[PDB]
Design a protein around this ligand. Structure first.
Ligand SMILES: O=C(O)c1cccc(O)c1C(=O)O
Length: 438
């Protein structure tokens, strides 16, 4: 397969549903490369657990943790890391209020080359145990010979774009990794980088990040088709921000507008949002504790009941993962019969203005609060007009894209409710025999 898109291993499904899945121990294995140094970009870390996932022979190689923690949280993380003299830390600046460092990425420097891993899991045991999570694995990028002058750039501009993303941190530890990337040949990369960084972007910078970045890529590198207004948009996420008093405030005015872009020319496009119901969580492998990683608060939700008519259940029979709650985030553009897709994005970005950006100053400025990162699969980058949807995620021509959940998405039933993490559920017990009392 050309896509190199994987799910994490799920404990408790039959082996047929983990053949081709990856655990973090698989990613860090010597079989992937002889580790010299690594950077772990993430949100939450269990440092003791994390070091154990590296092969024993590699556990003293340098590790950089890139995080966004402040004040006591920052102290707690440093205290976690203090016992390991090989671990350095980089605090990503979050100069806009309510921002988060959500990006989940491994930079893996080997004897043999460099690998980039963009994924959706926190570096804690529970995020790799029984959740649905996504991974993109880059090729092994060879080093450019010293004295040789070549760009090492791909047709998707991934090398420059990754360096640009790292430069936004303004961090000395990441300038070191920028210099590493400069020295490697990333020309085989067939995905486009879509990042968010905190800031207020106007003019020549508005298209660099967030949903304007997606819009720019779709305008430049996808083609519109006849009956494009019939191709739905699907968004799939593990949390929702405050979107406004109605759909015209942000969801359907600028977010949907960016996602329905195709091609360079000048809406009733169906929008499907996939988000676990209470029943999805209750009957999940984890039970109600899965809802600790689906942090939709009642304060947010009661301000936007209009949103929930868009919500569809989590269902993933195709990957045996209907009971493995999603912490992956994905966005895609299926055909009206869901048999093809015009593009697929896997990312850290949830359904929120903080993650995707919101227009300010009379539409001239895109304001983003958070760090996010994902990769975009476009048919043109593979010599194709569209992707055929793989019918069974783990089944057997390799030019079909492995969508990890079921299509078409299934609307919430009248008795379903979106999972809301900070109210109690005491009506029916979960798969472990417990209720939810936050
Ligand atoms: O895991 C994360 O990066 C995260 C952190 C804080 C709130 C969240 O909603 C999420 C998420 O849903 O991914």
């Amino acid at each position: 397969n050309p896509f190199q898109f994987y799910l994490t291993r799920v404990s408790g499904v039959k082996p047929k549903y983990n053949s081709g899945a990856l655990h973090i121990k698989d990613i860090l294995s010597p079989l992937f490369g002889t580790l010299v140094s690594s950077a772990q970009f993430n949100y939450c870390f269990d440092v003791d657990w994390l070091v154990k996932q590296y092969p024993p022979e590699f556990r003293k190689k340098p590790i950089l943790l890139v995080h966004g923690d402040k004040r006591e949280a920052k102290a707690h993380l440093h205290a976690q890391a203090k016992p390991y003299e090989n671990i350095s830390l980089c605090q990503a600046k979050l100069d806009i209020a309510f921002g988060t460092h959500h990006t989940k990425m491994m930079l893996l420097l080997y004897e043999e080359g460099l690998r980039v891993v963009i994924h959706t899991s926190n570096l804690i045991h529970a995020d790799w145990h029984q959740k649905t999570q996504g991974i993109w694995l880059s090729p092994l990028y060879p080093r450019i010979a010293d004295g040789t002058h070549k760009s090492g750039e791909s047709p998707t501009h991934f090398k420059a774009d990754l360096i640009s993303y790292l430069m936004a941190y303004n961090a000395p530890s990441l300038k070191e990794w920028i210099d590493v990337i400069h020295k490697h040949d990333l020309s085989e990369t067939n995905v486009y980088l879509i990042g968010s960084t905190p800031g207020r972007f106007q003019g020549s910078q508005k298209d660099n990040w967030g949903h304007f970045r997606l819009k720019k890529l779709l305008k430049d590198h996808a083609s519109s088709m006849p009956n494009a207004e019939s191709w739905p948009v699907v968004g799939q996420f593990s949390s929702v921000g405050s979107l406004g008093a109605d759909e015209s405030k942000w969801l359907c005015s600028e977010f949907k507008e960016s996602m329905l872009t195709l091609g360079k020319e000048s809406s009733s496009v169906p929008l499907y949002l996939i988000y676990p119901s209470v029943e999805n969580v209750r009957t999940s492998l984890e039970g109600y504790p899965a809802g600790g990683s689906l942090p939709y608060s009642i304060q947010t939700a009661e301000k936007q009941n209009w949103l929930h008519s868009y919500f569809h259940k989590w269902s993933a029979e195709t990957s045996g993962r209907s009971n493995a709650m999603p912490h992956i985030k994905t966005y895609m553009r299926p055909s009206p019969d869901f048999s093809k897709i015009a593009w697929f994005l896997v990312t850290s970005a949830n359904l929120s203005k903080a993650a995707w950006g919101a227009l300010e100053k009379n539409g001239t400025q895109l304001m983003i609060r958070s760090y996010e990162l994902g990769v975009l699969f476009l048919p043109s980058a593979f010599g194709l007009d569209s992707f055929k949807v793989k019918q069974k995620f783990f089944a057997g021509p390799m030019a079909t894209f492995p969508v990890p959940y079921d299509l078409p998405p299934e609307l919430y039933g009248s008795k379903d409710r979106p999972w809301i993490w900070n109210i109690p559920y005491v009506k029916a017990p979960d798969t472990h025999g417990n209720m939810w009392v936050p």
